[PDB]
Every structure is written in structure tokens, then in C-alpha cells.
Amino acid sequence: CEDIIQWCRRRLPILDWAPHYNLKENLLPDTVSGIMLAVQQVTQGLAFAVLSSVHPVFGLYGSLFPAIIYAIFGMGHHVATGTFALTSLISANAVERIVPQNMQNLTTQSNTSVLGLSDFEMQRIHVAAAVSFLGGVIQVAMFVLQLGSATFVVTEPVISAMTTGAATHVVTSQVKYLLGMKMPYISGPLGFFYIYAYVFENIKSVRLEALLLSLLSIVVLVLVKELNEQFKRKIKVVLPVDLVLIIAASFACYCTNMENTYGLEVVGHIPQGIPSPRAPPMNILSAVITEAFGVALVGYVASLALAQGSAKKFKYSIDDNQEFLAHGLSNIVSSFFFCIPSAAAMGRTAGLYSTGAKTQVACLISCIFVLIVIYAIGPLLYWLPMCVLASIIVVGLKGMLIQFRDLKKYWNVDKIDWGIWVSTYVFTICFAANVGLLFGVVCTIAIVIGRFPRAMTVSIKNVKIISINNPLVFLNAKKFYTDLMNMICYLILDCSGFTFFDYSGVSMLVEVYMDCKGRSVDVLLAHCTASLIKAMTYYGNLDSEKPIFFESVSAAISHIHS
Amino acid sequence: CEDIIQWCRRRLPILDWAPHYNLKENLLPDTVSGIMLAVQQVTQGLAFAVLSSVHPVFGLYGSLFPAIIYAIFGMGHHVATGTFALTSLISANAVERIVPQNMQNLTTQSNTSVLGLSDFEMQRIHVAAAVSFLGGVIQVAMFVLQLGSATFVVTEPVISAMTTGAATHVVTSQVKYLLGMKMPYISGPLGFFYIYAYVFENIKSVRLEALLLSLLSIVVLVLVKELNEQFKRKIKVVLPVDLVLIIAASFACYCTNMENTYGLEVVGHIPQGIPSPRAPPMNILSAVITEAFGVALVGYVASLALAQGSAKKFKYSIDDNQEFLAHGLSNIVSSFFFCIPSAAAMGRTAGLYSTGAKTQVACLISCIFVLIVIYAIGPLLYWLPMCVLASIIVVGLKGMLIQFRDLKKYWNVDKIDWGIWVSTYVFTICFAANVGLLFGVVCTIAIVIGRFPRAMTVSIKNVKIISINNPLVFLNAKKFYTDLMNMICYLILDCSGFTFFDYSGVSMLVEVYMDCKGRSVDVLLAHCTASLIKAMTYYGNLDSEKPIFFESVSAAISHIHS
Numbered sequence A, B: 001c002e003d004i005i006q007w008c009r010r011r012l013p014i015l016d017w018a019p020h021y022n023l024k025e026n027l028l029p030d031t032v033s034g035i036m037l038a039v040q041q042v043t044q045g046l047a048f049a050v051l052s053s054v055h056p057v058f059g060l061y062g063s064l065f066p067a068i069i070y071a072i073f074g075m076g077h078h079v080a081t082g083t084f085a086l087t088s089l090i091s092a093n094a095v096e097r098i099v100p101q102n103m104q105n106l107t108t109q110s111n112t113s114v115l116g117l118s119d120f121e122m123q124r125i126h127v128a129a130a131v132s133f134l135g136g137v138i139q140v141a142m143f144v145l146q147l148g149s150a151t152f153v154v155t156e157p158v159i160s161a162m163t164t165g166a167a168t169h170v171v172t173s174q175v176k177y178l179l180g181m182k183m184p185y186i187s188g189p190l191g192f193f194y195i196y197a198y199v200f201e202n203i204k205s206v207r208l209e210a211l212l213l214s215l216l217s218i219v220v221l222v223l224v225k226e227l228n229e230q231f232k233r234k235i236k237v238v239l240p241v242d243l244v245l246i247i248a249a250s251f252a253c254y255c256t257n258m259e260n261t262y263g264l265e266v267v268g269h270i271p272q273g274i275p276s277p278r279a280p281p282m283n284i285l286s287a288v289i290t291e292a293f294g295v296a297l298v299g300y301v302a303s304l305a306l307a308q309g310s311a312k313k314f315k316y317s318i319d320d321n322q323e324f325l326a327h328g329l330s331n332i333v334s335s336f337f338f339c340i341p342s343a344a345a346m347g348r349t350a351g352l353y354s355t356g357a358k359t360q361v362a363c364l365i366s367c368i369f370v371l372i373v374i375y376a377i378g379p380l381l382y383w384l385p386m387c388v389l390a391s392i393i394v395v396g397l398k399g400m401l402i403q404f405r406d407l408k409k410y411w412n413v414d415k416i417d418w419g420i421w422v423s424t425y426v427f428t429i430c431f432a433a434n435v436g437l438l439f440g441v442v443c444t445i446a447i448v449i450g451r452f453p454r455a456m457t458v459s460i461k462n463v464k465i466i467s468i469n470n471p472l473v474f475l476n477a478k479k480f481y482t483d484l485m486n487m488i489c490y491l492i493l494d495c496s497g498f499t500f501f502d503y504s505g506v507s508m509l510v511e512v513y514m515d516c517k518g519r520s521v522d523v524l525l526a527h528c529t530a531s532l533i534k535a536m537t538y539y540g541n542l543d544s545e546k547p548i549f550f551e552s553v554s555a556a557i558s559h560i561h562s
């Protein structure tokens, strides 16, 4: 049928922009954006595969396949799917719990040892792929039963606080690389403070060379990135400072013995790869349920925020339910190619904004470059120090960390969203990002619920006319009663603003009617829609041959003159 | 201070009705109600202490102390605290899990064997007392932080469905006594069907004498109780059919060997009691957390419903937070006297209505009679068959079971509360009463939340005037936008019905203003309270020297004429 064809065409938004592509003004900016995004995605993939307690080579795969799937199935134009450290910090818990460090040695190194990797490295990527697969199927299920229409519960302050707290957590997790020391996997309901306790207790074990390298890299990156923004009118491009820093650090670590003399840590091997696809270990799909739910929700909300921001900024329309399908398909297809959970990072979107990308082609061209890294520039990334990579990551987290300035706006506007922001931030700092999101949503719903029984439900208009403003539900059913008995020969209830109700509202309206009848004051109603009339005539046994319901306030006023 | 004194006086409502008592028209009906309630409380205490997997003598204690404490600390007039089978069915789970049947034999019978009971009987009453104590402290804590104001979330259909399902469960639990067979403790997420599966698989083990006795008792009870109400005008009293049935059954079981010849089951010993108070075992207070929460919530909700019904019927005012304190104190004080969890049953309230009780004195006089049962009529309750007791209980459950007629009203009024009723009933039948209550509350909140983004948010009134009906929160912030852009030189937003908002509402209002400015249509506002003006001027950078906010619609109309 025609409707079936329309439905099928609505699930592939690429056909909306592929034939309409213009190679006269949407090619050069898209190409430049792709080149500038390739290095960002490569560095983020490496640093967030190390953050996910898997081999760094798998973050490179995480920057290739989900981007293609989202380009085919995604609605947002400036959304670049990838590694997204927020989900890596969640999958690391499952990876470290199922496969702890005590099985590091005495391995096989053969018997389906994919790539050139040793054993105990496939045991961890298998758990990560299982987490990705379960998160993808959860997202697809949430697409089937249309929960994308229920995304209004996640408000702006909750997402802002959760992302700021997660940025602080990611900054904390990179501290050991900037300092140069080694720490065990510390996680839990208060790991943020335990990490710094460990750092301060072992302050004599830090390496000065790593500290100076990280400080120099951070200073140079911040200086170049802040000087380029202010001089945008003169310099009409974006300076690739990250690429220059990576090349300089690698060349300085190679034309020395800085891996041996001044004991440093570098990115290990990165073998040339893309092996044959393999199904994830469905045996583990029962022990990673909570991590799968956490990634499937956190990644979706963080990516939907970016998609909605892009749609608002560039004046186009997106669907909150198509993002569910796009992200679920990305995760499911990626889990077969040894990929960690994927989502959209705000830094890549900000880079796309600053470069001038137009369509999803900029997110595809970068993939073409990532392939080149897999097969050609793979072994070349041996001498990049982890201090420089950590400096790059913490400088790129600036957009997420700068969201502390929303506190002034929330204080000057609401002062109730200010408290929600602060509570969500402290919960995200203490426990985690998913706990922070859940707490924020629950707190928002509870606050909005506890504000109906303490708000004015009627308005007196200048026989007296009383207009019913808000809908009459169980939330403000009793408050309505005491609102109407407090404002007491005739009475007109203008029900034009009375849209929807329930059993409690109808029962309370009938109770008000009978109580006013008992106190020798008549109650004439108004528009009252058409279902309200039926409900009130059934509940109150109201006879149809008595004038109670009128078509307008003027009709009731005319009925008074009789 | 005077406020402290008034606060302390508000916590003892007995002083509100003790000195104002009138022993002219509030004594004879109160005395008759007390006499007619004593036998009801005795039978329910016995049959609900057996239902709680403890000795039947402890249900007699459960009908004595919480009644006194609620009389001192309670607001409702026709509320009689006691055993309340709904809470017994919850505490039985803890009793049977902590102390299962396999240690019934090989006991000590000494070393602080209270009263004359064997051991393994104190082991169960200790667990029940711990459950009641923890529930009481939970209720007192819920009184401290004033959660009694947040009781509007529990609606009438949820309570009705939960009570009907629990009544069906209680009818199921008494089936073995009516039939005469014996069953092991069956409970779980589908125990209601497993009980009947056991009954049908062992249909050859039922006792005919017990079945005929139960059928005769049920028929006589129903006949007398339905003939008495319909001849209320002639018979100006309530016939004590339960007392006559108990005496007749006991006397016909004594002047025969019906405990031996036609093998029956009778009430065991009922020793003369009221022992010394003893603190409940605090070692167990960690294994009964869920049962304590279940009783503390179900009992409070089912008793608050009755208190509110009484207040509405007899035109007085109660406090939803004082009931928390009264019930918590009742449970805590009763836990020291070997009592099972306590609450208010609907049958006792219906009996109080039908007798003519006026104050809480009718709930105290019965206590005086219960004392007589403890010390004098204790051993006399040996030959009462369990078939007659089960018949009495299932006939008394008529008020709870008749609530199926609310389905017609809910169908003819709402059709959305009808679905909530049905869903809560089926969940209560499947799992339990507490699960049913939780599901009902969550379903009500979810349905009410889902109904905001699909309701009309504005109303055009006959330049064009558009009145803002509902509050602008995150629930209907987006729906408002598309509601106002769809209805599009001048535009007036009558903000009289606009009462409370949040960040999302203010941001959406400012977005509508800017978009209308871009489309060359001016937006003039209205009353707009006083904080809305500040929020809109801050968020939108609105200058105070431009006419945007007016005091009334007529002022805006006058501004047009310029």
C-alpha cells in the first residue's frame, strides 16, 4: 500500500538529502569538516578505548561503522557518532568486573586470537561487544514501542548537570596520564574522591617529565584554541593544532629514547586490522543488563540533545523516535565488528559547527580517512605519549566543562531548576552519569507533581464569574474545592480553559455543585466541551430538563435576566 | 511559647472531644456499638492471627492495645484499629520465611516460654512483632518529614481495586478451612492459582462435614444479614447473628465428639494472658524491611481511606499527617505486647455506621469487653470450629467484595480510570496487595503525565486574543509552541489563567515572542503575574522602555488605538 511505502521511506532519511545534494556549496565545507573531524575521532577513539579497559585499536573501529550506520539512518545533520567517553566509563565497569586484572598473564595467544592481539584482550573486547549489542537491541525495542515521544521528561538542566558531572569524571580519569603514575581500577559510589586520595597518598611516585609534557601541551592547546576563536574574522579557517601537536610529540618521542630514558607511556601497537565479523558472546548477555541499560539511555539522551540543538539552530525538523532506531542499529551492527558502545559527543558537533559542515557527508568523508589510519598510519602511532593524548582530551572537554555558566541563568529565571541542576551535578559527581540522569528525571517529575496542589486553580473575573484555568485532575482536585468554597445568589463557572479531566475532577465539580445548591447559591456552567456534560449528568444524576449547561457566559447572563 | 503549646495540643485530638462529651445522646449508641464491635474484633483477631502464621491468642492482643493508642492519638471517629487481614497476609511471608515449618518439633518449651505456649511459637510471634515495630517506626518517620500531604497520588480507583483484589486473596486463603483439608504454606507471584490447583488435585481429601457446616453457616449468615438491612425500618436494631452462630457452633461441638468422630479443626487453646512487655528482637530488623514497608504503606492507605470517608459523611475535618503518627504509635506500642501489624478494617467501620456510633468511645468500650475475653472467656473458645470462623470471615468480606459495582460508574464517567481499576485488580490478584498499590500509583502518575503533551494549551477568544489556559511546564512546553504557531499584525496573550511555570515555559514563551517578531506580528502580553515579567525580561533581554506587558486586555486594546 501507499502508506506502507511512505513508512518505509520515512525510516531512511538519507533519501531525503542524498538526491538533493549540491556539489557547488556543500562539498568543500563538508570535505574540510571531514578532514578536521578525522583526527578528532581518531584521538578520541584511542583515548576512549583505553578508557573502556580494552585495546586502543578497537576505538578506531568504533569511529568507522556507527558513523556509516547513523549516516544511513540518522536525522541530525551535525551529529558525529563515535566513542563517547560517557558510555566508555559505563562499559569499563562490566569489562573490569567480568574479566579482572588477575588473569593478565598465563594466556594462550592463539586458538582464534583475532588480529595479532594476545589473549585476555579478546576476553575484554567480547564483553564490550556484548554490552554494545544489548544496548543496541534495547534501543531498537524502545523504538518499536514508541517511547521517543516520552522524551520531554528529560529537561535541559538535567542534561546539562549530567554532562558537566560526567566531564568532571572524565577529567579525573585522565589525571594519572598527565601525572605519569599508575593506578588500579578504582570505581564505585565514591570513586571520584578515592582517585584523588590515591593520587595524594602517592605524590612521591609522579613523573616530572610527564607532568611538564602535559602542562606544555595543555598551555599550547588552550592558547591556540582561544586565540583562533577571537581572531576568526582575520583567520577564516580553523588551525589544526591537534594534528601538529600529535606529529611533534611523536617525532620528539622517536628521535630520542623517551620511552626508555625518561620512562614514559605510549600507545602500544595498533595492528593493521578490520578482521572478519563475529557474533557477540550471547552467553554474557545476562550479566551486563544494567550496563546495557545505562549506555542505551545515556548515549541516546546525550545524542538527542545535540540533534535537537542542531535542528533548532539550522531550522529543520527531526524525529525523536528515529534517533532510537539509528543509534540501536549503529550499536547492533558495530557489536559484530569488535566495537565499544557508541554515541554522539558534543566536542565533535562543536567542531562541525566551527568548521562549517552542511550534511552527513562530512561525517562520511572522515570515515574514509579513518580507514587510511587502519591500514597505513596504524603502526605509525607507536610513539605518541599518553600525556599528550590526555592533554588533548582534557582540552577538548572544555565545551562540556563550561556549562557551569548556566547556573547564573537558572538562578535569575527559575531558582527551582537551579536546585535540580545542583542536585543532579552532585549526584553525578558522587555515583555516576546514569544515576545522575535517573535522579534528575525523578526529581523533576516529583517537583512538578508537588506544585499542582499549591497553585491557584480558578480566577475571578470582573452573580460572579469564575474561570477554571487549569485541568482538573487528581493533582489539584482538592485544592480546587477549597479554592471555590473560599470565594463564597448566583455563580457562573466559565469552563473555556477546562480542557481535560478525570474521575476526581468530575466528582469534585459535582460536589461543588451540590454544596452550592445546599447553600442557596446556584451554579451555572459554560462551554464545558461535550464529554464533561455527559460525565457530570451521569455522576450527579443531573436532569436534562433543567438549565445548567450554557453555550457561553453571555448565554448564562441572559438566563439570569428572567 | 504559645505556638509550641498549640502544636503539642494538636497532636492529641482526644482533648478535642473528651471534655465536650455528652452522656445523653452519645453514650447509649456508643455502648451498643462497642458491644457489637467486641465480637467482630474477637473473631477477626483470632482468624487473622491464624492467617498471620502465629498463635490465635495474639490476635486477641492485636484488638486491644492499638485501639487504645488510636483512640488517644487518632482523628477519625468511626475508625476501629485491629488485625486487618491485608497486613497479616504480608507479615505471614516474613514469618514463614524466617521460621519455616521444619523446626516445628524438637523444641524446649521452657527458658522464657511466655504464657504456656511451646517454643517455635515465640519464634514466630517475635518475627511478627519485629515486623510491626519496624512498620511503626517507618510510619513515625513518614510523619516527621511531612509526607502525609503527598497522599493525593493514591486515588479512589486504585484503593478500590487493591482492596477488592486483597479481599479475593483473603477469600482464597480461607478455602481450606471451609473445605476441611490441609495445605502447606503456598505464596508467591502466582499463589492464587496454585492454591486452587492444589484444591482441585486433592479434591478427594475434602471433608463433607466441614463443607456442610460451612455452607449452612454461610447461608444463615447471608440470609440474616440481608433480611435485617431491608427490614431496618421495622427492626430498629442490628441482630447479633455472629454471636448466636458462635455460641450455637461451640455448644453443638461440645455436646458431641465432633472434634474426634467427624474429624474437625477447632480453635486451639487461647490461654489467659497479657504477659509482661518485651522489646522486639532488633537482630531481625534487617530481614523484614520489605514486609515492614508493605504493612506501613498498605495499612495507612486503607485506614486513611476510611477516615476520609467518615469525615466526608459526618462533616468534620481530619489531618492526613496525624493518621501517620497515630498508626505508627499504635504499631510501636503494640509490638512490645506481642502484637501483629495493625490497621483499620472496612467491616468494622461499616458495623459502626450501621449501629450508630458517635465517637471513639465505642472503640474503647469494646476493648473493655476484649479484656473479659482474655481473662474469663479465654478457655471457653476451645470448641469453635474453624469452618464457622471462616464462614464468618468470608461473609464479613462482603463490603470489600461488593466494590465491583464501581466498574459501571468508572466506565460511564472516565474510561481511563476504568482501565487503571482493571490493571490494578489483575496485578493485585497475581502478585499481592502492595504490588497492586505500587502499580496503581505509578500507572496513575504515568497516565496523567502522558496526557499533558496531547491537550490543547491555549484558547482563542472572540488583532486576536489568545488566552493561556494551563500552566507552562516541561510537560506541555512544546505542545504550547505548535499550538500557537498553528493559530497564525497583532496578537494578545491573555495570561490570567497562567499561574505557575518553569524554565521550559519561560524559554518557550520567549521563543514564541521572537518568532512572532520575525514573522512581523507583534505579541502583547497581559497580567503576567509579577515573577513572569522578571523572568521574561531577563531571559529575552527585554527592555523596560518598550510596551510589552500590560495590566489587562483592555489596556492592550487601548494601546492598539495609537
Ligand SMILES: [I-]
Pocket: A084, A085, A086, A345, A346
Ligand atoms: I565525550
Ligand SMILES: [I-]
Pocket: A086, A089, A165, A166, A169, A170, A432, A433
Ligand atoms: I560518568
Ligand SMILES: [I-]
Pocket: B084, B085, B086, B345, B346
Ligand atoms: I480486613
Ligand SMILES: [I-]
Pocket: B086, B089, B165, B166, B169, B170, B432, B433
Ligand atoms: I493480599
